[PDB]
Amino acid sequence: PKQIDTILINIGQLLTMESSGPRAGKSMQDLHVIEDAVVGIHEQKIVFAGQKGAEAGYEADEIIDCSGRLVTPGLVDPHTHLVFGGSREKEMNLKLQGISYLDILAQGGGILSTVKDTRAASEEELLQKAHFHLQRMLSYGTTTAEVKSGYGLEKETELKQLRVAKKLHESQPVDLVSTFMGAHAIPPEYQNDPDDFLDQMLSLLPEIKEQELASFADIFTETGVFTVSQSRRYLQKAAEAGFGLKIHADEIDPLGGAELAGKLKAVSADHLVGTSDEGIKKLAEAGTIAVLLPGTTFYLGKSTYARARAMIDEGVCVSLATDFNPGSSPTENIQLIMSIAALHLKMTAEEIWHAVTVNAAYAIGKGEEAGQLKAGRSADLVIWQAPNYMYIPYHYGVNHVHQVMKNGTIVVNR
């Protein structure tokens, strides 16, 4: 019967992002915009979302007047390292002094610095710290996010990070996708035996699988870290073990991480700053989603961003993320990422919106559950303090959120 819980009326602009799959190449530009719209919600799910009139015959218990505001699905942040101990502010001077990201790491700092902190922090402290950051992420519009482990580089801590991720997911509104990234860096105890280290991380997959602590396996394929050869062997093992594949590829040096991702049919390849044309073609060919992290580029103090236009021109499905982490991108503001995407990745507003909703969702195996406002989907949406979708990435560095809804309930009210 047409008796539902909630209905949003007088929506100035509604972006349903309705799609039948990830958006690649030209389809990323095809943004469907509905003026003067409405959204019907019942039992935490979307009943209807479209032109004014669709609410005809319906009786709702709660009518939300959006005052001509912009409404879109809740945002998806497909790549973060949410759970971590300590912070790296004391490393700012090293970067200012011109020491490269990799040289800091080779010095025993960077990821290895955060590893010490994360290993030392209690499970309760990590949970408390992550809740704060995750709620801030929520306040900026993120209702679904991917979170990677990778600051343990040992059985105890990696497992602790995954358990924390599980707690967070079950104790607050943001839905989380967990990724095991024990292969983030080479810990001191394995400096001269990286392959053995990788095997130790692989030995953790069975129990991680049994306890459902992670759905994907990631790795940092980079100079001074893991080679393409080691990454292939590791990822193939991960796939046999039943995990989806992700990879931090061609972030700094052009090693061919992208090509490997495509060959292994990874769900996504992330960073891709130094990816070759062959890598771009391989990504498009395999349907591997290219998750760009313009925040990390900007934060590293660099001027060369990933070649997003070339990727889109070549048929790649592009996505974006904060890469929220203490070392190279300490920001929860996915909206700023949208702005950076426009100004430095040279993406259009349309492409950007598809990037943080539909493509972000598919990049983490949630293509059928998030990023779209259509019948059956969980009622996850954002009512913005803006009249149109171009305004969001246009006005930068702030929070444009008016209200955030998760499962049909307002969880953020500004």
Ligand X SMILES: O=C(O)CC1=NCN=C1
Q: Which residues are annotated as a binding site for 4-imidazolone-5-propanoate?
A: 88, 151, 184, 251, 328
Q: Which of residues 109-138 bind ligand X (CB under 6 A)?
A: 110-111, 114
Q: Of the two residues 111 and 147, which places its CB atom closer to ligand X in the complex?
A: 111
Q: Which of residues 249-278 bind ligand X (CB under 6 A)?
A: 251
Q: Which residue is nearest to Zn ion (CB)?
A: 323
Mark the binding-site residues for Zn(2+), compressed into ranges. 79, 81, 248, 323
Q: Of the two residues 314 and 323, which places its CB atom closer to Zn ion in the complex?
A: 323
Rg (CA), the chain: 21
Sign (positive or negative) of CA dihedral 211, 214, 217, 219? negative
Shortest spacing between CB 292 and Zn ion, in angstroms? 12
Give 395's contacts (C-beta < 8 A, 6+ positions apart). 339, 386
Q: Which of residues 301-330 bind Zn ion (CB under 5 A)?
A: 323
Shortest spacing between CB 296 and Zn ion, in angstroms? 7
User: Residue for token digits 């039943």?
Assistant: 242
| 248 in contact with ligand X (CB under 6 A) | yes
Mark the binding-site residues, compressed into ranges. 79, 81, 88, 151, 184, 248, 251, 323, 325, 327-328
| 259 in contact with Zn ion (CB under 5 A) | no
DSSP state of 277: H
| 179 in contact with ligand X (CB under 6 A) | no
Q: Rounded distance, CA 111 to CA 104, Å? A: 9
DSSP state of 72: E
| 325 in contact with ligand X (CB under 6 A) | yes
Q: Rounded distance, CA 331 to CA 414, Å? A: 20
Q: Which residue is nearest to ligand X (CB)?
A: 327
Q: Residue 26 is inside which H or E element, if any?
A: none
| 328 in contact with ligand X (CB under 6 A) | yes
Which is it for strands 3-14 and 34-42: parallel, antiparallel or unpaired? antiparallel
Give 303's contacts (C-beta < 8 A, 6+ positions apart). none
Question: Which residue(s) pair with 14 in the sheet?
Answer: 34, 71
Nearest alpha carbon to residue 95 among 103, 83, 84, 86: 103
| 350 in contact with Zn ion (CB under 5 A) | no
Contact pattern from residue 191 through residue 230 relative to ligand X, giving x for each residue in contact according to CB under 6 A and a dash for the rest: -----------------------------x----------
3-state secondary structure of 229: helix
List contacts with ligand X (CB under 6 A): 81, 110-111, 114, 220, 248, 251, 325-328
List contacts with Zn ion (CB under 5 A): 323
